[PDB]
Specification:
heterohexamer, A mainly alpha (465), C mainly alpha (57), E alpha+beta (105), C: mainly alpha, 54% helix, 0% strand, E: 105 residues, alpha+beta, 2 helices, binds a molecule of 6 linked components (NAG-NAG-NAG-MAN-MAN-FUC), binds a molecule of 6 linked components (NAG-NAG-BMA-MAN-MAN-FUC), binds protoporphyrin IX containing FE, binds a molecule of 2 linked components (NAG-NAG), Myeloperoxidase inhibitor SPIN (chain D), Myeloperoxidase heavy chain (chain A)
Chain lengths: 465, 466, 57, 58, 105, 105
Amino acid sequence: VNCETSCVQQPPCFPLKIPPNDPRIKNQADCIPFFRSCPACPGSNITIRNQINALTSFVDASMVYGSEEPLARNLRNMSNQLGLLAVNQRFQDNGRALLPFDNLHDDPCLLTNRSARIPCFLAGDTRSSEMPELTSMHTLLLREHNRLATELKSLNPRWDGERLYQEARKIVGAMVQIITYRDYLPLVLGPTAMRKYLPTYRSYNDSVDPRIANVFTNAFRYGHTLIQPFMFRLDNRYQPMEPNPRVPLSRVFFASWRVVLEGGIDPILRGLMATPAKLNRQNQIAVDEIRERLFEQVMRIGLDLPALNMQRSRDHGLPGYNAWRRFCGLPQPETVGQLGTVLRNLKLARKLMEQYGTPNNIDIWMGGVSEPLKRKGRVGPLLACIIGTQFRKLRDGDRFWWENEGVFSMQQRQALAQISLPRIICDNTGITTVSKNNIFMSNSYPRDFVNCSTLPALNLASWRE
Amino acid sequence: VNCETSCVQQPPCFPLKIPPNDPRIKNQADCIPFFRSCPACPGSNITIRNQINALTSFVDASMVYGSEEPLARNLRNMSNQLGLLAVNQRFQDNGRALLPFDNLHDDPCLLTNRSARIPCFLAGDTRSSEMPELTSMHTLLLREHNRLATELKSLNPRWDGERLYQEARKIVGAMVQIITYRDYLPLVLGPTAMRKYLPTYRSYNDSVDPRIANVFTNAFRYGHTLIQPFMFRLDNRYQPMEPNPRVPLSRVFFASWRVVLEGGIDPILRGLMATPAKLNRQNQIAVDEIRERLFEQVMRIGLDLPALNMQRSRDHGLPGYNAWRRFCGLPQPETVGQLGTVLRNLKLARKLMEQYGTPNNIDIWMGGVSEPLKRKGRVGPLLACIIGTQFRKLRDGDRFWWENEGVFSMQQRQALAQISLPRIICDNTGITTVSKNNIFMSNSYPRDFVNCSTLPALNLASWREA
Amino acid sequence: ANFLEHELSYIDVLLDKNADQATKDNLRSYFADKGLHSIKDIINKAKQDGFDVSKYE
Amino acid sequence: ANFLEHELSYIDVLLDKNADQATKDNLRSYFADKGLHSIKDIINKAKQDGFDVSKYEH
Amino acid sequence: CPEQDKYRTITGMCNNRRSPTLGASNRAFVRWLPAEYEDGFSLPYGWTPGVKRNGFPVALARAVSNEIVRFPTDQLTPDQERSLMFMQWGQLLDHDLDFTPEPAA
Amino acid sequence: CPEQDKYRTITGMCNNRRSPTLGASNRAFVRWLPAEYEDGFSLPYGWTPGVKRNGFPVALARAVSNEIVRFPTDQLTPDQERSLMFMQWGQLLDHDLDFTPEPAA
Ligand SMILES: *[C@@H]1O[C@H](CO[C@@H]2O[C@@H](C)[C@@H](O)[C@@H](O)[C@@H]2O)[C@@H](O[C@@H]2O[C@H](CO)[C@@H](O[C@@H]3O[C@H](CO[C@H]4O[C@H](CO)[C@@H](O)[C@H](O)[C@@H]4O)[C@@H](O)[C@H](O[C@H]4O[C@H](CO)[C@@H](O)[C@H](O)[C@@H]4O)[C@H]3NC(C)=O)[C@H](O)[C@H]2NC(C)=O)[C@H](O)[C@H]1NC(C)=O
Ligand SMILES: *[C@@H]1O[C@H](CO[C@@H]2O[C@@H](C)[C@@H](O)[C@@H](O)[C@@H]2O)[C@@H](O[C@@H]2O[C@H](CO)[C@@H](O[C@@H]3O[C@H](CO[C@H]4O[C@H](CO)[C@@H](O)[C@H](O)[C@@H]4O)[C@@H](O)[C@H](O[C@H]4O[C@H](CO)[C@@H](O)[C@H](O)[C@@H]4O)[C@@H]3O)[C@H](O)[C@H]2NC(C)=O)[C@H](O)[C@H]1NC(C)=O
Ligand code: HEM
Ligand code: HEM
Ligand SMILES: *[C@@H]1O[C@H](CO)[C@@H](O[C@@H]2O[C@H](CO)[C@@H](O)[C@H](O)[C@H]2NC(C)=O)[C@H](O)[C@H]1NC(C)=O
Ligand SMILES: *[C@@H]1O[C@H](CO)[C@@H](O[C@@H]2O[C@H](CO)[C@@H](O)[C@H](O)[C@H]2NC(C)=O)[C@H](O)[C@H]1NC(C)=O
Ligand SMILES: *[C@@H]1O[C@H](CO)[C@@H](O[C@@H]2O[C@H](CO)[C@@H](O)[C@H](O)[C@H]2NC(C)=O)[C@H](O)[C@H]1NC(C)=O
Ligand SMILES: *[C@@H]1O[C@H](CO)[C@@H](O[C@@H]2O[C@H](CO)[C@@H](O)[C@H](O)[C@H]2NC(C)=O)[C@H](O)[C@H]1NC(C)=O
Ligand SMILES: [Ca+2]
Ligand SMILES: [Ca+2]
């Protein structure tokens, strides 16, 4: 009944059973912990179970600002009328801001080092501290808000705290929108699927449903295939930082301490920019730092993120692979030979047939990440359909989409078109040399790196009253 | 608060307020009773409210057989192994079966004629007694079941009760399927929409959702426009039956006594076959017997079925007209002039705009029934889209669709292709002259009538199991 | 919940001494599924539900 | 639910004698929305939730 | 759901083997469009006095009936090309397809 | 739903004016396909021992992971044309979009 310590299968626990000849877990009476997701309609014999989204579906930077009204108030600096977000009041990063600390029941970040007694961070989403690279991205956007607010006040002295926070939030949201749809998604879907699932924006459509589909919570976990087994940190010459430049991830999960003490966010960001991602390969899907040692520092046993993915699929009642191919207009393989043709791999086909029996029962994440990738993309046809379909609904179904008439002026839009994640680092960190062009493709120092001065800033001239 | 007697608006009640200058209800403090439909997830702040279908979406003759297993058992004659449905034990119709009587806590039928003390009937659906014409059709299908079971027993003597029942049920289900998609829906949609929404059947598709859509519960009430204000009864020369050949509908709702004591189902069926439907017209939508006197004999006030339809759609959270046109790929008029073009009627467009302000708020039933009818159909393009779309899913998404490989043999399929509703009436009543061609178009006696002998029966030879 | 009028004819078959034993067991089984186990239970349930059982002795 | 670490700095502004009174009313109002009406109620909530408020008493 | 079936369930269950409630009795209707309620999730338009729908007053359903639907019944137009059976079969068919329960008192 | 507004709500509410919960927080996911549960409506595949899915035993997720996903970490292939920031922005973006609550302890 306590899903963390028992292996008993009784609500709300759906523990993963252990096969014979597991490489890590020898004991078949053990399990991997799993809580079924909260039902929309607790207790019902009539409804078909469904899970809940605790956030706004929209790309509105809710991970910065919160998706619930109390939390949003708590994240704000209410000691002034400058419309700023709260910053850590105990520690700083070479003078720059850090996320405030949260007050949790069983702070997992405290169970990581213990000596350092550094609690978890507080942010718009609850997972700010899961890996320090994520925390550095939260911290960056927090600082960018406070930058924008400061500058807007300076430019519009008459403006109060509400107006400031709101106007800055509007910009932080639009910056997430632009990075996401201009620089990122085309490198996930590839050119052909981008043009197919995300044609040039026209206008808002009050009849497009902007909800997140159940299936997207599992299919967007494609990015678990990109996760490298170390966290990389670099000095001001983009050289390894000593003494510990390559931390195994099993020692980075929930490690808020590493941010406050082991040099702040500047090193981590440099590392993200100059280190390549892992490539998905059909024989190299995900690594053991998440497949064997996920959250080992804060739990009884280490977890298998891939297997969690596949248990969740089942907890959420997701149809299998072939059903999703039919949905997306893709051929549905029945035999092992036909699955070989779809995967360009009769070996992987055989392996999936040995486990699943039919291509119909293949779990979505597994089938999805098995598929050969699209040209210049990092997902295959199935996953590109699901992901592409969803991001279109979040653009066309968003009343406050940055390009929609009435959200920004033509002048304001012209200014925003110059934003770039590189500049945001230039503007909010101690880093003076950053990636170029697509930050998501640039990955080699020094070849792919430029000086900050060579980059245009965001002109807030159009935000004068 | 009892929604039947209170006009207070407190859950679960959503009473219809009365406008000033109501032609019928002079008392503005009065109201029309309405219970909101039961929520799937009662009490939730998180889910978006939705209603429940208590029946099988499939065209499976569930109104004969029941949609719940206890009820289905109770509908069966369990005193022998003949696989029959239970029949009335007190009354017959010139030798022939009636539906048994139900035992209700509050039985509205008993209120229609207090002296005759005839309760409501028991059937697969709970509404069989609402109008004697509906009861006659339920009675017919029950009889057809017992005929088929009898004949199958004769043909396959070793078969037990369960086998008989199931095979007869399977046939009655296919008979409803065939009448519905061969004879009925083409005269609802018209040929253009039929070819668009109901192309030739291919095979079962386990990926087609066969659920009823919320909107369909409101949009299929199009048929309220076809309702005539009398029940017609005719004798065995197809001449008016005395004393009362034309009974006002407000005196036939729940009036089971009329079937039992005023001469059985043969005159009611004759009436159906040899009397026109009402035509839907833009200035003649629905009649006063359902707009002013619905169930007036069995409640405190007469109801307004059209108004109920529109309150219900609001209860069920349905989008308005223009949202449904967008859904169906149809133009969405903004202005009164554009609504006039879409309705081919500027006067009605004005009337709808006077009430609703925008075509976006027109309730779906009202917008649906306002549309000019498709050629050789009796709905317009929006209702034809909704209704066509639904019945496509009910066919393609049904594993036991009669034409699906493995449900019937090829021989059994050829046999079923002969069935017709007129023959069923011949086989189960004292009527020897019935409608020709499409029963649904044939309507004038004697021009459109034939002798039963001219009609071929259902041959059950391919049901023989050696 | 409620006893049905046509079920009274089933009470007649149970009290028919010359009716088939297999027929009686099929009906007892029908009623046993509805929670009525003896002929007394069945007649008593019909009374509760408004029927007149005076011709049962 | 739980008192937050950064809210301790708000207790400092309230107890700053030389601070702006409009600033103090903004904060009183912030805490009054959370159900905390007096400076005592605020300090006595922070202690429950794991913080030290002795640096504000004897 | 039994991997073998000769006849249909009474409840409609197991018709669809992958998703065996679909079409069965006592389940929710399917939604082809997101729902439209006064408060977002529960309340019907017309519930609260003064609350507009999409910027316009909600018309009383009985007013809409009175002003658009009512007509003089002796002027009714018979359908040359449809029998009364055509209406009756529709009702009988509706009763194979849908029944939306309401609380009792 | 204010008929006029300048900024977004925190909850996402009123973003769509016709259907104002759409995209708001603490609302159910939308289903693009009918759901697939062991018992039709709630139980997950693999819940009950010996219950097959569409005619075949349900694979332990950890078995699938062991056989299909596991690889030697020293073999890992760097992506020439994607930075580590490309994975990180995905996670940050995931957290703008969805979070599926579970009970605690
Ligand atoms: C068995 O039936 C299923 C169910 O389909 C339905 O069956 C009947 C009831 C039909 O009358 C009709 O009502 C319907 O087709 C059949 O599966 C369907 O197959 C179609 C065709 O591929 C497929 O449509 C494609 O969907 C994708 C995914 O997005 C869709 O769903 C989301 C849901 O919210 C929507 O937001 C979205 O708008 C869309 O509806 C979509 O990407 C495809 O469109 C893109 O590609 C097209 C070209 O490839 C292009 O023309 C278009 O502009 C887009 O770029 C869309 N394709 C087309 C041609 O419409 C359904 O999703 C799929 N659904 C299901 C439930 O499986 C199935 O074929 C049939 N099988 C057999 C054996 O007959
Ligand atoms: C605003 O967006 C609306 C939604 O747009 C969707 O999402 C965006 C992000 C894009 O992906 C977009 O391409 C998507 O469509 C959009 O409204 C939509 O418009 C389409 C096209 O008119 C409508 O599709 C039509 O639907 C009817 C009804 O059947 C549908 O529902 C049933 C049950 O759910 C399904 O089984 C069907 O597969 C359909 O999904 C169909 O009858 C119709 O097709 C028939 O007619 C066409 C034309 O002759 C033929 O080509 C077909 O073969 C068929 O014979 C269409 O499929 C869709 O319902 C509608 N959705 C909504 C929400 O109303 C709208 O147009 C956009 N507005 C603007 C101006 O941008
Ligand atoms: C004699 C003919 C008909 C009626 C008497 C009658 C009555 C009703 C009533 C009272 C309702 C409920 C209204 C409410 O919102 O409270 C109702 C609903 C439905 N109808 Fe009616 N109807 C008669 C005739 C027809 C015909 C000819 C129809 C269509 C061809 C038809 C349809 C429907 C449908 C589908 C419903 C909804 C059923 C549900 O409970 O979901 N009716 N009718
Ligand atoms: C350092 C990188 C990442 C993690 C650590 C991490 C961890 C998780 C965990 C534990 C889950 C929950 C699994 C479960 O079913 O219990 C999880 C879910 C989701 N991920 Fe993960 N993830 C890391 C990295 C990524 C990247 C790069 C993603 C996208 C490109 C990504 C996506 C997601 C998504 C969308 C989910 C589901 C979210 C929800 O709660 O709805 N993750 N991740
Ligand atoms: C709210 O904003 C104010 C103003 O920026 C912050 O005040 C600064 O706090 C830092 C760190 O404690 C001090 O070194 C500065 O001297 C302060 N500046 C001024 C001008 O007062 C305050 O810390 C913020 N509060 C929160 C909770 O973030
Ligand atoms: C746990 O956190 C402690 C607290 O900072 C880390 O200790 C510091 O490590 C650096 C680098 O070795 C030393 O220069 C400091 O003097 C240490 N501080 C103190 C006060 O101990 C420690 O390294 C962390 N644990 C691990 C395994 O890294
Ligand atoms: C079950 O079927 C039997 C046989 O058809 C029915 O018995 C007949 O009932 C009628 C009406 O009471 C009698 O006139 C006949 O004499 C009976 N025939 C025989 C062969 O006994 C019986 O009524 C049916 N039971 C139910 C509940 O419908
Ligand atoms: C109500 O039911 C009674 C039967 O209890 C009907 O009375 C019969 O009416 C017919 C036709 O007028 C007479 O020939 C019968 O002799 C009457 N029977 C008895 C015993 O009274 C009555 O007409 C029904 N309907 C009305 C309009 O009240
Ligand atoms: Ca969001
Ligand atoms: Ca049915």
